[model samples]
Target: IKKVVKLSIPIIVVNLLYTVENMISMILVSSISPSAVAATGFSLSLLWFIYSLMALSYSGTNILIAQFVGAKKDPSPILINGLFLSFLISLPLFFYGKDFVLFLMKVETVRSLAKEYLTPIFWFIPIGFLTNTFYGAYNGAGDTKTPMKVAIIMNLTHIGTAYTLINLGVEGAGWGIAISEILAFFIYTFLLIFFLEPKLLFKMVRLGTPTALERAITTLSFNVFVGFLAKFGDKVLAAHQIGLRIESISFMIGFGVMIASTTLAGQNYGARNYRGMVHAVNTSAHFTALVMSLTGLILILFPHYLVYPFSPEVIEWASYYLQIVGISQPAMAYASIYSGALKGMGKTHIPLFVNISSFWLFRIIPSYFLLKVISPLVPWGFMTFETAVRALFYYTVFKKVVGKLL
Candidate 1:
């Protein structure tokens, strides 16, 4: 438990920095206009769809690499292969970027503006994806300082450039953020490679090709679903975006905690400290639940207060959406805790399957009906339902898995 808490603190701080960075960026855009704010939020939500696919790549790489680290194996192949996978997966996303924006635009008047903002930004897909992949490699090695340093530099660049662009003009703001990210990615990748040993670098090069191929196919499926989600009207999409952003805020904390959970669990598991691993898992699950539950309540109660800074219009649109999200928070929190526990146990496949099934089968399908046939609240209800189902699934699985291991 002490180990988990210690390790999780850095992760929490790092994610907090990231969350604040994004929130500040959105607030800056909101200061321009409600429409601009909405457009920014909309574009970010659309980006998440792409990011979700990227998760498939990142998760696969992280799981494999972390296992190697736990076993005292070399991680160069994992790094190299992960980078190769990211490039292959990112290529199609880069080419079809405009199309993705166009599809997202169908959701609202803000779509055109979002498309404009996103088109130039799409060019940074490879940069963002590859940098993230490399970061995953660093994470697999259980060294958070390097990434934290990289994040500090990246956030500083994002703030400076994003501020400069917004002042220059809204269009400039778009390009500014995009360009900053590109430069940051280059620096991060170079530093990561430079500091590592030659043998690791060689292995990285060798492993890159095959991983890229597998990740590309996974991303393709994700892109298809995102295209489908874009069919919902702009208001729905915008509301969805706000909901997602709030959810992300909650999840980022959980993710930080998960990092600790995974590291401690892996360490103790490797040491045959079964009791220690169980203690870490239980403590993490409860701690995460408490923290996230309080946040969920705050968001539900004062969503408008929390959101109006972004834009009055966004606040208005997100009013009900926030409540829905707030209610779902507890379930979402549990899902994260259990999933983190699974990751600690080197059980990535379970969460992957649960996510894929719950998202496509339960959430997406119900969302379609809610938007087209039912009321808006229906979609929110579906989100809540999906989380409940997911939480139940993971809890059951976690119990069984832990029981068997014990």
Candidate 2:
């Protein structure tokens, strides 16, 4: 129990630090105009989609590392190979990011501001990729504390840097994070920089593909959804971004559990301790649901406080979003825990299918149809609805997987 809490809670802190940076940026620029807020927010939405592609190394390294460590084998070569893969995946983003940014932004004003914000960050992609690899490697080795401590240092640096830099322009925030990623690369985990395992690289990619694909499609679906909402205007986008960050207070807690589930379950699965893996995952869902539900309650009860800095209209729209998303927080916990649990055990295809099916069939189509016929509130309601269906689908599949293991 102590192990579970210690492992999972630091991740919650780590994720929350990221969220804090997001909100701090919003609060700082919001004084300039809704346009500034909208521009930064929109840029981040597109970047979220791009980062999903990088999850190949992030999820790949951690899950596989945990497996090797659990089986009591040296993961040195896998770790190095993982970092190599990370660098390879980062190249396109560095070269073609501006085009990708331009393609995603609809409004001219929003487009230009987004470009400014992203340009500085683009140069840092390779380092960021390596940093993610390092973090995932530590996570896989069940040494999450190293990454957590590193993230804290980076977070403090970003706070001071962005706080001062925002006085210059929105790009200041970009440089702040860019600097931190560069700083984060100071700690790298490897046996030998020269040791490259060509054959095992494919194995890491194979295990990570479903998760990588899941993240890609999920973010793409979201970017598409954001596109749908784009027609609604910047007020909606700004509100969406604010709500997205605020709602993360709930989901990130869920994500912490997912990481622990993936890591612990992966290790146990490699050791062929099927029931032991199940215990960590099942217990994870319980505690995660409890914590997320509480955050959901906070979302429902005090969303106005969370969005108070924004304009009245933006505040109204964002508060409504929080209320709707809050109802689904528990559902999200179950879905996330089981999904990561499956992925940890090298069974990501099922989690992948369930997530893709639920998001597209239940959320995407319904939200689109609702937009044609009803209020954005109902479209937001569809977001809540899909999570419930997704949780059940994952739960059912998880039981069957356990049964086979038994």
Candidate 3:
């Protein structure tokens, strides 16, 4: 119990720190213009889409490292190999992200700003991806404190740098974030190399090559969805991006709690504490639902307060979009929390299928027709509707799948 609690608390802190960095950036960017904020937001959305390529590394590394550590096996070699693989995978983004940014931005001017923000940021991808490898190894070994401490340093540096540099203009903001990331990467790398066990390093050469076929498939699906979204106009694009940002903010708490749930559930499940594992998921759902409902209500009652800080113009557009999304927060939060539990239990395929189905069949495909034939709100409606369906599907699958496993 102590081990589970200790592991989970740090994961929660690290996730929350990441959220704070993004929140700071969003607030600062909001002070620019709605279009600038929207452009930054849109570029980030596309960046995340690109990052799905690394998801396998992020998700797979943790799972593999955890398994190895559980078996009392050395993971150093696997860690280094994972870092090498992530760097190799991230190279294309640095080279091709300019074109990708242009493709994502609908407005010519917004496209230019998006490029300005994204190009320098791409330089940090290698460092960022590599850092996650270390994080995976550390967490898998039950050393979440290392990553949690690193996260504090990283986010503090990020906030300090961005606060100072954003005053110079948008370009400075981009530089600030990029530099901070590089700094954190070096710091984490130094600690990982110096402090971690030496024997694991030799094990890297013995491990088999990591197949990234799963990642490639996921990336392809995301790109297809992004392409469908692009067919909508700039206004719709901007609105969609802002809505996503708003949604992400609300989702962060759920994500944080879900991290705690995943850690506790994984440990308990592994230890054969079946009743404890069940309690973790149930409590996690109840807590997240209450939190998300409160957040959604705040957004519903005073959306302008929640939104005005970003950009008024974008907020005006987002007002319509979030009004619809705000009501679906609990459902979305349930899906996120339950999916985290599933991942902890090594049930990735079902969640992936459920998410892809929800994104395409329910969200993206309907969004296309909604944007083209009906109104923007129609797409928003479809999105909210999809969240409800996804929540139901994820919960049902989790209950059945986990019950069977237990």
Candidate 4:
């Protein structure tokens, strides 16, 4: 437990700070208009989809770094490979990004704003690649505090930039985020460089392709989920964005511990200590569940307070999202932490299947299918059950896969 805390606390702080930084942006955008807020949400979802592709580099370098560090090996080559891979991934996303914005958003006002907000980011994709690669490198090295410290300074800069740029309308918000990637690049550059190894890059793909696919499909599925929010009106769309920022707090909290679990599990596995790997994962799951349950309770009790800063009009609607999803935070914790551990144990395929299946079966298909066949609101009841079933599937799969290795 102490060891977990030692690693997890900085990570938790990093993710919390990132979440807050994003929330601050939402607040700023919300002040402009609910339409603005909805636009930002659209951009954010698309952003996640792009970053999901970059998992090949982020998670790729991450697991490799932890494994190598644990085995007392030099991973200097991985830095170069990760950066190059990220660079390669950015170009296509950059060139074709506008088309995606046009295709995904049917609402003219929201789509215009999304295009405005995302343009700068598209031009600056490689910078973000640099930022994420560095983060993952340090993160997987089990030196999370270094990255956390850099993140703090960088996010502080982001808030200030976003505030200053608010006058430019949503375009400024886009530039603010773009400048952030640039600023992080400079701030994070207290360092040296390296050479590439093709074999290592291929190995990264071998190990990381599952997670890459997992993130890709999951992100696309959720984008469809976000699409559903549009039919309810821009108010509901804005509310969904606000509620997402609130929920992200808990996700970041769980993901912090999840990454710690990944690192610890990777280390143990590198040392050929299978028992310790399982123990680390279980411990991580325990800690995250407890922390998230308390957060869940707060979500149920005071969601209005949380959402008011982003958009007061959406308070009642958004709170339902928080409160309803809050009931299943413990389940979310289990799924995330266990999946993190599995990724570290080189069992990425397990989560790749579980999460993809869960999303299609438990979330997208059900939400969309039941809505088409029955009342739209009737599917609301099944939303909470989605994550719960996902949790059950993940935990059982986690046990079955790791237990076999045992």
What's the lDDT for all of these models? 0.66, 0.79, 0.66, 0.77
Candidate 1 residue runs with Cα over 4 Å from true position: 30-39, 98-100, 107-116, 193-248, 262-276, 293-330, 344-346, 356-386
Model 1 poorest 10 in a row by lDDT: 205-214
TM-score of each: 0.71, 0.87, 0.72, 0.85
lDDT (Cα, tens digit) per residue for candidate 4, span 1-406: 4488777889889988887888788787788677777788767766777678777788888888888878788888887788888887777877887687668775346577777778888889888887788888888888888888788878877777888898588888888888878887877664543216589888888766888888888766765776765667666777775776667776777778778887888878888887677777777777777877898888889877777887754777787788888888887778767778878777777778877777677777778877776532444456665557777566777777767876
- Of the two candidates 1 and 3, the one with more favorable TM-score, higher being better, is 3
- Per-residue CA lDDT of candidate 3, range 68-137, in tens? 6545566566676678766766788777866866775652575667666666677777777777676766
Model 2 C-alpha RMSD vs. true structure (Å) is 3.4
Q: Order of candidates by lDDT, top first?
A: 2, 4, 1, 3
Backbone clashes, each candidate: 9, 0, 2, 0
lDDT-better candidate, 1 vs 2: 2
The candidate maximizing TM-score is 2
Prediction RMSDs, each to the true structure: 5.8, 3.4, 5.5, 3.5
Give every collision pair in model 2. none
Candidate 2, lDDT over the whole model = 0.79
Candidate 2 wrongly placed segments (more than 4 Å): 28-39, 102-116, 166-171, 189-196, 224-242, 298-320
